[PDB]
Every structure is written in C-alpha cells, then in structure tokens.
Amino acid sequence: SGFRKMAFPSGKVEGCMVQVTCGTTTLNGLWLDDVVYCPRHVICTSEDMLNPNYEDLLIRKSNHNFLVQAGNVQLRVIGHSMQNCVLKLKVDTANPKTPKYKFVRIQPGQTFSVLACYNGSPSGVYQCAMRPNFTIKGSFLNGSAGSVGFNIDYDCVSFCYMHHMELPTGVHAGTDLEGNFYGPFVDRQTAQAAGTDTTITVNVLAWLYAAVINGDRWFLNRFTTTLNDFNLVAMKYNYEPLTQDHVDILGPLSAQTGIAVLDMCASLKELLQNGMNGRTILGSALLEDEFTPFDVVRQCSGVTFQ
Amino acid sequence: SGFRKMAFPSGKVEGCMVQVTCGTTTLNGLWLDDVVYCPRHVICTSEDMLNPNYEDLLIRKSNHNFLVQAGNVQLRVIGHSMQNCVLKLKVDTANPKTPKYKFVRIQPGQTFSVLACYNGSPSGVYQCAMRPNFTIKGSFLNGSAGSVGFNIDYDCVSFCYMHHMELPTGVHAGTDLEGNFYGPFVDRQTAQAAGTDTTITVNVLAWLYAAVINGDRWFLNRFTTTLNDFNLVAMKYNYEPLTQDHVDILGPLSAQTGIAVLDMCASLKELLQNGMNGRTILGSALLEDEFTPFDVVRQCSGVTFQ
Amino acid sequence: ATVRLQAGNA
Amino acid sequence: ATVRLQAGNA
Structure with a gap:
C-alpha cells in the first residue's frame, strides 16, 4: 500500500500560535486559554546572550513591555511569571479555539510532529524522533524559537517539545512544556556538545x-x-x-x-x-x-x- | 541548519472534508461553497467495477440516495451532475469555512502535499512528487479515495489531485479537480500498468x-x-x-x-x-x-x- | 493483476 | 564553536 513518513494533521495547534515581541527580539508563543507560553530568552538582548542573569532582567520588565499579536488582534498582557526556562504571560482574553490538551514528557526513541513557525505564522509540518543523546534532527532557521512538537490521540493534543536552540553540529535542543530542558543543556551561547548517539x-x-x-x-x-x-x-x-x-x-x-x-x-x-x-x-x-x-x-x- | 521533507500546514483543507455514502459504498468528498466534489465510482457496487456504464447507473439515482455528513451535521442534497470522472453534488448550505482557492493541473516533476483521510476524517499529511510516468508513490488504504493533494501560496489553496485507485505495482493514480485523469488510466478494475519511469x-x-x-x-x-x-x-x-x-x-x-x-x-x-x-x-x-x-x-x- | 479501486464500505 | 539561540531580531 506504500509506506511514508507521515505527520499528524495540524490545525488544532495552529490556531494557538502567536507572536511575542520584547523590544527588538521576536519569537513565537503558544496561546492556551488566558495564558501565553514562550521561551524566557525573549527578555534578553544580544549582549545578554553570553551570560544572562534572567532574574535581574525580568524584575525590570513591566506588563506593557510585552507586545503579543494574534494575527491582527493585539492582546493585553495583565501578568507574567517565570517557570523554569519558560515565561507565562497572563492575557485578558481566553482563546476561543483552545483544544483539549495535555502536557507530557516523552522518552528517547519516541516520535512527534513539529510545526515550524516564523513571526507567529506556520511554515510547515514534519515528523522527528528524540535521539538517545536527547537531541533532535529538525529544520530550523533564526526566528523559529517557540515552535512546538506534539502528538494527537483522538481529540487530545499532547504537547511535548518547545524549540530553543541550535548546536554546533547542526542538531537542535529544547524543553518540555514545563520548562525543563531535555538533556544536559542550558539556554546560553556557550560551548556545548551532543554526546555519542546510538541506533534505536x-x-x-x-x-x-x-x-x-x-x-x-x-x-x-x-x-x-x-x-x-x-x-x-x-x-x-x-x-x-x-x-x-x-x-x-x-x-x-x-x-x-x-x-x-x-x-x-x-x-x-x-x-x-x-x-x-x-x-x-x-x-x-x-x-x-x-x-x-x-x-x-x-x-x-x-x-x-x- | 537542517533539511527535511516538509508538507504545507494544513487546516484550511480539513474543514472542507466530508463523508459521502451511496448505499454500502463510502468515500470522501470536498465541500466548497454549496458544492461537494467526489469520485463518480461511489454510485457503483462491487460487481459494477468490472465494466460500469456510468450514465445508466447515474440516471437511476435520486438526490435522496446520497447521504452527506460533515461530522455530525447532515447536509441535504438538492442536485447532482457529472463532469468527466467527478460527481458534483449541490447542497443547500454553503461551507462557512471555505478558503480562497484555485484549481490547477500540475506538470510531471512538481510536488504537492497529500491529506490522507478515512470516513471523512484526516489521518495524516505528507509530500509527494508527480512521477514522469504520471503516477505517485503515496500511502493509501481502502477508504482513502477522495483524498486530495494541494499547494498553498500565501492564502490561496491550489487543489491539483484527487485520489482514485491503486495499481498492481503499488503505485497510485488519480485525476485533477476537473475530473480528467493524469496519464492513460481509466476508473476500472482492469489490467493497467505504469510505463518506464525516469529520474528528474x-x-x-x-x-x-x-x-x-x-x-x-x-x-x-x-x-x-x-x-x-x-x-x-x-x-x-x-x-x-x-x-x-x-x-x-x-x-x-x-x-x-x-x-x-x-x-x-x-x-x-x-x-x-x-x-x-x-x-x-x-x-x-x-x-x-x-x-x-x-x-x-x-x-x-x-x-x-x- | 487487476486494479483495485480504493473505495470503502459503509 | 558556540551555540546560536534562534530568536528573531524584529
């Protein structure tokens, strides 16, 4: 009958993707109910990337410093907190297209679909596997941070991956939706290397x-x-x-x-x-x-x- | 960076997929405005596949013989006509989620995304190329007929392929959205073979x-x-x-x-x-x-x- | 080897 | 070789 690399049908998640801008830095966010989840490095500048003290930089930010756009609709931010490596922006309207959803942390060897997005708009969808060394082999350019990986079961979307960074050997590293990194990585422009990979x-x-x-x-x-x-x-x-x-x-x-x-x-x-x-x-x-x-x-x- | 086989983001098409049932035969249809497009072999039974006289079989069908379901909503059919190898069912409500769209006929060597569907529900999305011998190498089981291939340009969906049949060598054949077959094929369970394929x-x-x-x-x-x-x-x-x-x-x-x-x-x-x-x-x-x-x-x- | 038309069943 | 954090610049 044939055999092809097949991704899950999308759409339930695309209606949840937004753009978050903090000064000159822009990336993607995930809008569920009245909360937007995004990578915390959005509050850094280019000099901050070497050694960012995230607590000090976040203490200096007020609600109005965050520009959140869903297509044309601007959303007013009314609160913010940090959980591990993820920011949570409380907004004043709940997303009407919010699906049934779960947060899961996957094991090495498991697969998922990635929705690559730039400037809050989707570019494409493809399947990837979590390698034994806790990296993935994706396709990501500058601007793609905040794109998410997911699985579907009937009607429930399980979100398992948020993209954060690119490594020297052209592999990619990120977090779960609770903000804990997969593998021994940190969100810093430092020397880091993937370990020996094995075949599943x-x-x-x-x-x-x-x-x-x-x-x-x-x-x-x-x-x-x-x-x-x-x-x-x-x-x-x-x-x-x-x-x-x-x-x-x-x-x-x-x-x-x-x-x-x-x-x-x-x-x-x-x-x-x-x-x-x-x-x-x-x-x-x-x-x-x-x-x-x-x-x-x-x-x-x-x-x-x- | 990275390089992967990437499909277009879906959702605009999923809102257009319906189930069409004629007696015991069931397949997929495409609901645009107040018209549903589907393969004409839906009006055949299992004996009819050998040598179906489509005109005779369609003369005997009334509007009420077509059961069209969009999820839970039943749609009333109020007219039907045949264009080449495709049926057109006029329905009494226009699809509110209809996108901007075009019909195009692609050239060999061009690529497109396929949305595989069963019983009116999507299963997955993947990319394929039109081979020089006018076949595609997809992944399709029984029930998949009526699934469509498409490209996106900004906001305009170009529909280019409707699936119809499986060939002996496990390749697949279909039509454009005007009902003309790609290549020298016919919608009959007869001896047919793909010609010599070349590399693009x-x-x-x-x-x-x-x-x-x-x-x-x-x-x-x-x-x-x-x-x-x-x-x-x-x-x-x-x-x-x-x-x-x-x-x-x-x-x-x-x-x-x-x-x-x-x-x-x-x-x-x-x-x-x-x-x-x-x-x-x-x-x-x-x-x-x-x-x-x-x-x-x-x-x-x-x-x-x- | 004959073709299989890939319609389903109700 | 250092890591590149893939954020935008807009």
Whole structure:
C-alpha cells in the first residue's frame, strides 16, 4: 500500500500560535486559554546572550513591555511569571479555539510532529524522533524559537517539545512544556556538545516488519539467535541493547506477520555483518530507525482522528 | 541548519472534508461553497467495477440516495451532475469555512502535499512528487479515495489531485479537480500498468545545491562538462535530458552558492559513473529526486503563509 | 493483476 | 564553536 513518513494533521495547534515581541527580539508563543507560553530568552538582548542573569532582567520588565499579536488582534498582557526556562504571560482574553490538551514528557526513541513557525505564522509540518543523546534532527532557521512538537490521540493534543536552540553540529535542543530542558543543556551561547548517539534497535525492527508487510522479504533468512548472542553483535555496531520489554512491545507485529521476533533479530544480525549488497528496502539504502511500533501500526491500519 | 521533507500546514483543507455514502459504498468528498466534489465510482457496487456504464447507473439515482455528513451535521442534497470522472453534488448550505482557492493541473516533476483521510476524517499529511510516468508513490488504504493533494501560496489553496485507485505495482493514480485523469488510466478494475519511469535530473541538481548549502561539499570536483556530453552520459543511466530552461531555473541557487550549474553537472556525472563509495549526502545513501528548486528555496529561506 | 479501486464500505 | 539561540531580531 506504500509506506511514508507521515505527520499528524495540524490545525488544532495552529490556531494557538502567536507572536511575542520584547523590544527588538521576536519569537513565537503558544496561546492556551488566558495564558501565553514562550521561551524566557525573549527578555534578553544580544549582549545578554553570553551570560544572562534572567532574574535581574525580568524584575525590570513591566506588563506593557510585552507586545503579543494574534494575527491582527493585539492582546493585553495583565501578568507574567517565570517557570523554569519558560515565561507565562497572563492575557485578558481566553482563546476561543483552545483544544483539549495535555502536557507530557516523552522518552528517547519516541516520535512527534513539529510545526515550524516564523513571526507567529506556520511554515510547515514534519515528523522527528528524540535521539538517545536527547537531541533532535529538525529544520530550523533564526526566528523559529517557540515552535512546538506534539502528538494527537483522538481529540487530545499532547504537547511535548518547545524549540530553543541550535548546536554546533547542526542538531537542535529544547524543553518540555514545563520548562525543563531535555538533556544536559542550558539556554546560553556557550560551548556545548551532543554526546555519542546510538541506533534505536526496536525502531529498526519495526521498520523491517513494515517492509515485510509491504512485501519486501528478500532479507528473511532461516536462522535464529539468542537475545544475549544478538546483543553481543549489536554492541559492536553501536546499537542499543534489546530488552525483554522491547520483544513484548513487538508482539502484535510478530503475530500479524507470523514471523517470530528472534527470527527478525537473526535477519538484522545478518544485515549488520554483511551489508545490503546494493539492494534497497522500502526505497532506502540505509537502515531506518525513526519509526516506532505504534507509528507502523497506525499507518498500516489507518487510524484516524476526530 | 537542517533539511527535511516538509508538507504545507494544513487546516484550511480539513474543514472542507466530508463523508459521502451511496448505499454500502463510502468515500470522501470536498465541500466548497454549496458544492461537494467526489469520485463518480461511489454510485457503483462491487460487481459494477468490472465494466460500469456510468450514465445508466447515474440516471437511476435520486438526490435522496446520497447521504452527506460533515461530522455530525447532515447536509441535504438538492442536485447532482457529472463532469468527466467527478460527481458534483449541490447542497443547500454553503461551507462557512471555505478558503480562497484555485484549481490547477500540475506538470510531471512538481510536488504537492497529500491529506490522507478515512470516513471523512484526516489521518495524516505528507509530500509527494508527480512521477514522469504520471503516477505517485503515496500511502493509501481502502477508504482513502477522495483524498486530495494541494499547494498553498500565501492564502490561496491550489487543489491539483484527487485520489482514485491503486495499481498492481503499488503505485497510485488519480485525476485533477476537473475530473480528467493524469496519464492513460481509466476508473476500472482492469489490467493497467505504469510505463518506464525516469529520474528528474533538475530535482537531483536542486538536492545537491541543498547539500552544498548545508555544508556537504565532499562531492565537488574540479572539472566541467558540456550540455550535450552530460546528456549523453545521463541518457545511459535513465536520467531525463537537461534543457536550457532547466539551467535557467537553477540560476538563483547557482548565484546563492557561487557554483555554476555546469560544475554541478560535472559532479553529478562523476557520482553517476563512480558511485558514492560508502559516503552519504544529507543522511541519504541514494540520490534524491523529489525536491523542486522552489522547495529548496522555500525551506532554506523560510517562507511563511498567512 | 487487476486494479483495485480504493473505495470503502459503509 | 558556540551555540546560536534562534530568536528573531524584529
């Protein structure tokens, strides 16, 4: 039927995006009910970026210093507080298009959709995965700070990521919607580096199940392996360890296809030791690790949202 | 920075999607003003697919045989006509959320976003290209017929594709919004096959410019080539001919990067004759041909929509 | 191999 | 190489 990288349908969140301007600095905010959430570095200038003392700078700001615009409508700010690394601006009108929503903190290996926005207006939507080293591989230019990542379940939007910064190696770092950073990062223009990244084995296994379901079965061998023996090989190629919980999570796909998990492990082991010999899987010449098992089930079974 | 496959922000289209049911057959429709557009095979049963005489079947249908639902609201149908391969159902209320819109017929090589829907509800959004053989490589299950492809320019939505069918090799075929099929296809469960597909050279050149802009410059050589000699090599590897118009279209990217088009042509020729030698470009081990020059400019310059 | 027209069911 | 905080300038 095909297999593509699919983002959640947007719109419920776009009606929540606003522009926040503090002097010459401009970024994006998220308008829910009568509160606007935005990155606290909006109150800094260009000199402040080296070592900003956020408490001192925020003590000097009054409500009127914040210009919040929703398209054409100007919103009056009537209060402000700081929670960790996020600002909260109380405004005098509740957003009529506010959806049902939750705040969640995701685990490494989980995926989400990003809505890239500039000057309070959306530019595009794409899917990304949280890497084991707590970075994401996005596409972000200057002006994009405050863009958010989200998942949808029926009618409830789970917000999980707010964008803040770009790192030297061209990777990206941000916070949850409570203002705690993912990973060991700080909102400062200092020397920071991403640690060694690993490959999410369970996602690769999900992708091979997707390939089998779509009729690409050339890589299926006839052998089996043990978990410990598999993990001995996996460790050499910078793959994450497979746990018994992961095998249980892959259960529905295994039942659907009739291929035991340990057989897929044997086939992955052979792919790792021998390469692809010029062949492709699902149009790709590299192994893909950015599909969770839920992503595969959702796409291959056609789950919809109200 | 970063480079990802980016879809247009949705929402303007989701408010236009409805469910159309004719007896036991159900699919999607597009509600604009007081007209609903849907595929005409909705009036067929399962036996009819082999050789449907559409005129005879449509003469036997009255307005009340069409059940149109927009979420919870039932809409009363008060007229119907057939234009080519599309049905037009006149309904008694105009859609209040109707956007500014145009109908366009795209050329092979152009890209667009697809909004996959089931039972009148959206499942996901993704980008695709019109292949030289007039197919697309989508992701569609049973129930997806009537989903539409679109582009956005500021505030105007250009609808260019309505989905109709799946082919043996797992490719997909449809019509424009005037009801004319792309390519030599018919809406019948008969033997049909996609012709030989070619690689869109200008899109590959755009992708190499994207790579250069993102700092992947290992493939740049020191030679140049002539257009005729390049097309002599290209023809051997099943690449489309490069025309002088294509060379002019690549002008802005060339100016931005300071690399003449003919130097990129020499580098592509070397990649074609020698392979990638285990290296990757932009995380990919194959050459990518689904980015137009406009896509690259848009993503790398950050164009937004109202 | 025949084509499959991808309509759904009620 | 230092980090670039991706805020606007308008």
